[PDB]
Each structure stands twice: as C-alpha cells, then as structure tokens.
Amino acid sequence: ETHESGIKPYFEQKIQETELKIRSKTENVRRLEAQRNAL
Amino acid sequence: TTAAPLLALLRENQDSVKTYALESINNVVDQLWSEISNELPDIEALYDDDTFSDREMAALIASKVYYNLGEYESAVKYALAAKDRFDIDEKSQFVETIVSKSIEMYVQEASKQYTKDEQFYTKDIIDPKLTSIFERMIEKCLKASELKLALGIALEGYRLDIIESALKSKLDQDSTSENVKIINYLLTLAITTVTNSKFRSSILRKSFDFLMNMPNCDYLTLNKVVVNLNDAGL
Amino acid sequence: LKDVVEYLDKVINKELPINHTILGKLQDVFNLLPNLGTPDDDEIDVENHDRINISNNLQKALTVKTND
Amino acid sequence: LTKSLSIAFENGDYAACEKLLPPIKIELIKNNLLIPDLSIQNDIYLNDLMITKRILEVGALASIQTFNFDSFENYFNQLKPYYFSNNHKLSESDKKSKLISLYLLNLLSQNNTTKFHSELQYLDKHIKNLEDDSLLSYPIKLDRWLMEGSYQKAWDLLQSGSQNISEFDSFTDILKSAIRDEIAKNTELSYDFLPLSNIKALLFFNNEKETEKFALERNWPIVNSKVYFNNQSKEKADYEDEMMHEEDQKTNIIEKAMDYAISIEN
Amino acid sequence: IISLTYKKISLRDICLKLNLDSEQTVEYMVSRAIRDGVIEAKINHEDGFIETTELLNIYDSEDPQQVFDERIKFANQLHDEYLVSMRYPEDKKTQQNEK
Amino acid sequence: FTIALAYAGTGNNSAVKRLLHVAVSDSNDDVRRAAVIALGFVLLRDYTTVPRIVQLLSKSHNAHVRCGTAFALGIACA
Amino acid sequence: SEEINSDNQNIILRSTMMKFLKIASLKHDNETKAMLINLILRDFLNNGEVDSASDFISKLEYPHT
Amino acid sequence: LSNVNSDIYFKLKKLEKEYELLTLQEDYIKDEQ
C-alpha cells in the first residue's frame, strides 16, 4: 500500500487539474442556460 | 541559518569554496527556497560552465527551487537538462511534481512524431533521458502488480513497443481467465480512446494473434476484433 | 481613393486624353481640406472629452440596474 | 599560520595578505562545518564560533582598505554578509557598531537609498537601543540630509569627515563626486543657462579650472567666455523621441472606443 | 503650501516664515523636490524668485481621457462579479424538490 | 444526414458542433428539422446527456424543430 | 521569555510552512493557501528581511476566489 | 490506495470523453443565445 501511496500523487496531478476544470465548467453551462431561457 | 553566508561563498572565486557552497545550499534547498530565488541567474551560469565537476548538482538546485515556487514548467526543463539524480525524485513522497511533468510532455511529443512516421524511436528528437524515465515508470507498476496502470499510460502516447510486449509476456496461463480479462479491458478502451487510424488498427490486429495462441481462449474475444476491423482474411 | 491615384499615372504614362473635370474636383479636395495645427482641432478635442465622460456616467447607471 | 595573517594585518602590508588568502579560504570551508548553522547551540560550538569570527573581521576590513574595484568586489562579496552579523554569545561586541557603520556607508556610496532602507529594516529589531547610535550615527545623519534635500549641510558633514579618516576615506571621495553630480541633474529643470561663476558655486566645485573642465565634459561649448547649453540639449531630445516601444504605450482615442463596445456585446 | 499661496516668492521670504536657516539651503531642498515633481515649480536664480508653473487648462489636454477610460473598466468588472455569483444558489434550488 | 450516417456511433465532437451550428444558423424549417434527427445517430450509444441538449430545442417556436426533437429522442433510446 | 532554545526552534517553524505550501498548491485549496501566506508575510517583517518578502509576493497565488 | 489508482486509468478515462462533449455545449449556447 506504501509503495502505491508514493506514486499516487503522480497519477493524481493530471486528473485533479481535469477535475478543477469540470467545477468551473458546470457552473458556466448552467449560467448561460438561465440567460438563454429568459430570452 | 539565513542564506546570506551561502550566497557570499558562491562569489568567492576560488574553486573549492564554490563547490563546498553547492553542498551547503543543497541541504536547505527543500527547507528554504524563497531567499535564493533572487540569485537564480548565478546558479544557472555555474551549470552552463564545464569547469565544475559537480556541475550536475548545480542545475539540480535551480530545478528544486523552481518546483517549490510553483513554476513547474521551469523545474522540469532544468531537471531534464542535467540527466542526473532523477532516480531519487521518482521514489520520493514529496516531489512527484516533476515526475508527472516529465511523463506528460513525453506522451504528447511521442504521439506527434507517431502520426508523421511510425518510426520515431530511432530519431534523436526523442531524447534518451526521456525514454529512460518512461520504462522506469513501467518498472513501478509491475512491482505493485497492476497492469492497467502500465497499459493505459503507454496507450496515451502511441507507444507501439510497450503495448505489443505487454500482451505477449502475459501468456503463461497461470489462470486462463485472468489472461483474458485484462485483454478484454484493453480492447473496449482502444475503440474510443484512440482516433489515429495507424495506431488503432495496428494494435487490434496484433491482439487477435496473441489470443489465438491460447487453445483455451474465448472466441468471443477474437470475434470482436474480426467484426471491428472487418477483414475477411482474419 | 486608390483608383484616383492610378488614374493620374494613366494620364502621363498611357496618354488618356486629359479629363480636366476630374482635376477640378481634386483641387477642391486639397483646398477645402482641413489644415492641422489650426485651433479648430483644439475645439474638436473638447467635444470628444465631453462625450467620453457622458459614456462613463451612463456606464455607471447600468451598474445600478445590474446590481438590483 | 592563522597567526601569520593576523600580524600581517597590523604591519599594514596588505599585498602579501592576499597572497596568503587562498590557502586560508581552503581552511575557512572547514571552519564553516565546525559551526552547526545554529541548529544545536552549546558551548563546544561557541568556541568554534569565536575563533572563526576573528578571521572574518580582520579580512573584511583589509578588503575595504583596498581600492581597485575589480579585486575589491570579488574578495568582498562573501565577506559582506558574513562579517555584518554573525556575532557570538547572542550578539554583542564593540566591533558590531564599527563594522555596521562601514557596511551601510557602502550602500550610500553605491547610491542606492532603496537598499539603505531595506538593510536598515533588518537591523532595526537588533539595534533599537542596544547600541542606539554610536559610530552608526555617521551614515544616519548623512541620509537624513539628502532626504531633506539639504545639499549644503551634507557637503559640510563630509568636509568635517576628514577628521575621522581611518578607512572611512574609502567612501569619502566617492561621495564628493556624487553630490556634485546630483545637483547637476536637478538644475537642468530649473533653468538652461548659468553664467560661469554660478556653475561653480551651485554644484559645489572649489576650483575654477574644474568648473570649466566639468562644463566641457557634459558637452557645453564656451565661446567668447559664454556658455551655450542650447546645442547638445536639442540634439539629445531628437534622438530620444525615436525609440521603439511605442504604439501600445501611446494609444489612440479610437482604440479605447473599440474596447468598450465589445464588452457589451460579450 | 507656501508656493501654492505665493506663486512668485523670493527665497528670502520663505526662510523668514518658516525660520529656514539660509537662502542656499532652502534652494537646494526645493531643487530636490521638483526633480521628483511634487512642488511642480521652477527656480529662477538669475531673477530671485521661484515661480509655480501651474496654469490649469488640463481638460483641453488628453489627461482626462486616461482617467475616465479606467473608471469605465472598473464598472464593468462590477457587473461581471454580479453575474457569476448570482447563479450559484439557483442551481441548488432547481435541483432540490420543491412543494 | 450525410454527417449523421458517416460519423455514426462514437460521438465525434466535430460532427456534433457541426450539427448544432447548422440548426441555429440556417433558417429554413425542414433543414432545421434534419439536424435534430441527425444528432440522434451520432450519439446512439451515448444518449445520456442527450435530453439535456435537446431541452433547449423543445422550447423552439418552430413546429418543425419540436417534431424532429420528439423523433431524435425516439431514435437514441429506441 | 527570551531564550536560545526558542531561537533554534524558530528555524524549524519556517521550514515546515515552506514544505507544506507546495502540497497545498497542488490540491488548490483556497482555505489552505490563504492561511499559510498571511503567516509567512508576517514572520518575514518581524525578522526584517525585505528581500525574501518581495520574492514571496511576486507569485501572487493568494486566492480571492 | 491501489483502488484509487486503478479507477483513474480504467473507468474515468471513458467518462473524460463525455466531459469534453459537455464543454462543447457551453460554446454552443453562447452562439444560440
């Protein structure tokens, strides 16, 4: 388990950036959806 | 204590003083880094020169500082310049920052030269260092014994060598089922993930032959390749 | 504008019969051409200053609407 | 060995002091490893701290009394952060006041007030009233007067500063030229033309020939005993105006108009 | 302050008011100041007075525009801040069941 | 429907942007209809996010667009 | 109370914040980044070091999110 | 800790194709709006 914890953060770095993007993405699409609806 | 003695010693012209200083700074480079950021262009100049014989160490210091600051891009280039003492980084808890970078850049570059020519290994466009990191990372996966880690990373980079070799070496049939299952996971991924014709087509065709060797193989698995590629001769 | 430039070359290179009417119009262009360094230009700048300010005040009022 | 260096200093032959220095730099590496870098502090390390100290201090002062720039910075660069404060037994000594005063004066002679303040900030906690001002007052008064912009008063302190010359002259001479230069820069705003008699008095020249010498050197022709600052000035201005940076810095009213419109239409 | 009240003011006057030591000393302090451009003055040595250069009519020059250009940008930056934050609670509610 | 049939099954991002772009921009009413039905083919095996897209397209004034919206959903999750 | 032991342990205290800040940038925690930066800027003024403080602010990773 | 790693390579890569498509949607409704 100890061996895997060392290399885990190397797997993680590319994936977490992808995650952080998703958070911004989700808020964006919905907000334009509201503008789109009202119009 | 402060970096002020340390800085002072670089400046001393005499060879042995500068060398001693490099060791001294190296100890506290991880502990303290914001104080010698100022004075980075000097550490860099020492790395340039080819009078020093701990020259490899001088670039290591520049690299270390740059990752702590958070300029990850500056870190990885300076590290890949020296081609030394990267072994320790891979195997550390703390610094997997520059390890991830070396792996990302490498997968991208490889795919780009893969589309132009199927052979791009032979070209010196791919640096030997870059290579060496990669197969060390295959080394970690297999000790932990989890082959999905090895297969996917390679897959991203259009690395034909690594993929072919993994499937061939799997053939031992310690359990028959286990062989199948790992191959089964690769094919589903390969339709979707890969989009370049040359890589995609080549790995499925190859997969059919490996499976076929086993007499206890599922012809369900073989059937799939044969429909996708739609080649009667198979 | 460019075509008027090449028309003048063609009078003196390719020998079109000189259409003096054209030349008459171009004299009126040089002559009724605003001249720079004139204090009229200074006046112009004042008018510009006012409208760019008024834009600024309208921009703020829209802030109050968006804020509600 | 180490004692040879100490007495070489007192004789005042410093040329030979440098010839011995590279062997001693080899031994100063060892000396650094004796000190723990104040991780653990006990009275074993304290003994080492005291003996390394004496070497640093006499060696620092030799570099100051030498006076050819090239060699002077290079020997000095290490010495300067070492000698200004690592002081043993938490950090007294009478030498502490004298060595600080000479470091701070260096920065005023490099004509960086910015750094003079930056270095001063560091010191402040450790000299609040411990030494208060002693010989320390010498860079402190000087700063005060240039900040006020009392050029007169400043010149006065330097001139009187010839009393106390002991190794301080290493700065005194630099500082003369510096006042004279500064004034020259300011009075270009004030007016363009000075009669010859005024150029000397303002810029604090003491020698008639030097006034007229300095006049020629900033490229001012004196013709028929009358200065004509008009020529070079005008030529200088023309070459400055042409440089390349320039399109984005200067801008344009239409450029601004175009940025506003497209904000709305996002 | 003394310069803003008294536009052309002999060097002699200034010293008398604020008890400055001498004409040579005050000249130099003033000289230092207008390099860094706070006083916005000029010394006329030859005529014995220091003359404030201010005259107004800076509305005619381009400087108000630079000022006002910024003020528009600040308002716009306000609007954006409003818009983004505003929608974040609404997501929660639409997703939650309501009566 | 050239795009739909060629680019079937695996979503393609190129194919999808193209379809939506045509539907918004191109005013005629049969043509607007053709792009919605067409999207259901490209995303036949990835019909998860499909109602969230066509959510917008239900509300369209056009009678034709609402028709092709009804069918596209039919086709995807048949 | 002033003591040299307090002083030895002070060097330990600086070094630990610097090692941890890199870990906490990668998780991009708005809370964590904020707390650490306020503490470090304060420590530096107390010891008077101009130079370190300017380098530390250049980055501006201090969130406002 | 092995589990975490294994899903990163396995399941999650297939869901990342999906998340590229939803980002396309954001672009799209700026044009539609």
For residues D102 and D138, is the Cβ–Cβ distance under 8 A?
no
For residues E91 and A30, is the Cβ–Cβ distance under 8 A?
yes
| Beta pairing partners, D227 | D222
In total, chain A counts a number of residues equal to: 39
Q: Is G49 helix (H, G, I), strand (E, B) or coil?
A: coil
The DSSP code for E44 is E
Give me the total of CB pairs closer than 8 Å, taking one residue from chain C and one from chain E. Answer: 35
Give ∠ CA D250-D252-D255 in degrees, rounded to 5.
Answer: 120
In total, chain F counts a number of residues equal to: 78
Closest Cα in chain G, distance from residue B175 (Å): 41
Name the token pair of D25: 């730099």
> Residues of D with CB below 8 A from E43's CB?
187, 190-191
- Residues D126 and G48: their CA atoms lie apart, in Å, by 10
> Residues of C with CB below 8 A from E67's CB?
none
H19 touches chain A (CB under 8 A): yes
For residues F15 and F3, is the Cβ–Cβ distance under 8 A?
yes
> Residues of H with CB below 8 A from B152's CB?
9-10, 13
Closest Cα in chain B, distance from residue D38 (Å): 7
Closest Cα in chain F, distance from residue A35 (Å): 12
- Residues H9 and F4: their CA atoms lie apart, in Å, by 31
Beta-carbon separation of D260 and C55 below 8 A:
yes
One-letter amino acid for residue B8 of the chain: A
For residues B80 and B130, is the Cβ–Cβ distance under 8 A?
yes
* Closest Cβ opposite residue H9 in set B144, B148, B192: B148
- D-chain residue closest to B8, CA distance: D78
Measure the N-to-C terminal CA separation of chain H; round to a whole number of Å.
45
* Element at B40 (helix H, strand E): helix B40-48
Beta-carbon separation of A3 and B143 below 8 A:
yes
D1 touches chain E (CB under 8 A): no
Rg over alpha carbons for chain F, rounded to the nearest Å, is 11
Beta-carbon separation of D38 and G11 below 8 A:
yes
Beta-carbon separation of A4 and H22 below 8 A:
no
- Residues D44 and D34: their CA atoms lie apart, in Å, by 10
F49: burial class by Cβ within 10 Å (0-12, 13-18, 19+)? Answer: middle
Measure Cα distances from H19 to A32, B156, B209, D118, F9 in Å: 17, 18, 35, 51, 17
CB within 8 Å of chain A, chain B residues 87-106: 90-93, 96-97, 99-100, 103-104
Q: Is H8 helix (H, G, I), strand (E, B) or coil?
A: helix
> Residues of G with CB below 8 A from D121's CB?
48-50
Closest Cα in chain A, distance from residue F54 (Å): 12
Beta-carbon separation of A30 and E91 below 8 A:
yes
- Residues A19 and A12: their CA atoms lie apart, in Å, by 10
Strands E8-9 and E41-44: unpaired
Beta-carbon separation of B35 and G61 below 8 A:
no
Residue with tokens 């499976």: B211
Name the token pair of G16: 């630990």
Beta-carbon separation of G47 and D125 below 8 A:
yes
Give me the total of CB pairs closer than 8 Å, taking one residue from chain B and one from chain H. Answer: 23
E47: burial class by Cβ within 10 Å (0-12, 13-18, 19+)? Answer: exposed
Closest Cα in chain D, distance from residue B15 (Å): 10
Write a three-state SS string for chain D.
CCHHHHHHHHHCCCHHHHHHHHHHHHHHHHHHHHCCCCCCCCHHHHHHHHHHHHHHHHHHHHHHHCCCHHHHHHHHHHHHHHHCCCCCCCCCCCHHHHHHHHHHHHHHHCCCHHHHHHHHHHHHCCCCCCCCCCCCHHHHHHHHHHHHCCHHHHHHHHHHHHCCCCCCHHHHHHHHHHHHHHHHHHHHHHCCCCCHHHHHHHCCCCCHHHHHHHHHHCCCCECCCCECCHHHHHHHHHHHHCCCCCHHHHCCHHHHHHHHHHHHCC
For residues E30 and E39, is the Cβ–Cβ distance under 8 A?
yes
Name the token pair of F47: 């019909």
One-letter amino acid for residue B9 of the chain: L
Q: Tell me the Ramachandran region of residue F77: left when phi exceeds 0, alpha when psi lies from -120 to 50, beta otherwise.
A: alpha
Give DSSP secondary structure letters for chain C. -HHHHHHHHHHHHS-----HHHHHHHHHHHHSS--TTSTHHHHHHHHHHHHHHHHHHHHHHHHHHHH-
Of B176, B174, B164, residue with least CA distance to B218:
B176
D263 touches chain C (CB under 8 A): no
- Strands across the sheet with E41-44, in order? E8-9, E49-52, E41-44
For residues D222 and D194, is the Cβ–Cβ distance under 8 A?
no
Rg over alpha carbons for chain B, rounded to the nearest Å, is 24
- A-chain residue closest to H23, CA distance: A25
For residues B53 and B22, is the Cβ–Cβ distance under 8 A?
no
> Residues of E with CB below 8 A from A34's CB?
87, 90
One-letter amino acid for residue B5 of the chain: P
The counts of H helices and E strands in chain H are 2, 0
Closest Cα in chain A, distance from residue G28 (Å): 9
> Residues of B with CB below 8 A from H2's CB?
144, 146
Task: Tell me which method was used to determine the 3D structure.
Answer: cryo-EM
- Beta carbons within 8 Å of D205's beta carbon, 6+ residues apart: D180, D199, D211, D214
B175: burial class by Cβ within 10 Å (0-12, 13-18, 19+)? Answer: exposed
For residues D150 and E33, is the Cβ–Cβ distance under 8 A?
no
> Residues of E with CB below 8 A from C55's CB?
72
- Residues D49 and D91: their CA atoms lie apart, in Å, by 11
The count of other CB atoms within 10 Å of the CB of residue B37 is 19
> Residues of F with CB below 8 A from A37's CB?
59
A36 touches chain F (CB under 8 A): yes
Resolution (A): 7.8
For residues E87 and A31, is the Cβ–Cβ distance under 8 A?
yes
Name the token pair of E98: 């309501």
b/e per residue, D66-100, with b = 16+ CB within 10 A?
A: beeeeeeeebbbbbbbbbbbbbbeeeeeeebbbbb
Beta-carbon separation of B68 and G15 below 8 A:
no
For residues D229 and D192, is the Cβ–Cβ distance under 8 A?
yes
The DSSP code for B127 is -
E58 phi/psi in degrees, rounded to 5: -105, -5
* Closest Cβ opposite residue H26 in set A5, A15, A29: A29
- Beta carbons within 8 Å of G28's beta carbon, 6+ residues apart: A16, A20
List, as own/partner pairs, every contact residues E33-40 make where C-beta atoms lie below 8 angstroms and the sequence separation is at least 24, other chains included.
Answer: E33/D149, E34/D186, E34/D189, E34/D190, E35/D185, E35/D186, E35/D189, E39/E3
* Closest Cβ opposite residue B32 in set G15, G22, G26: G15
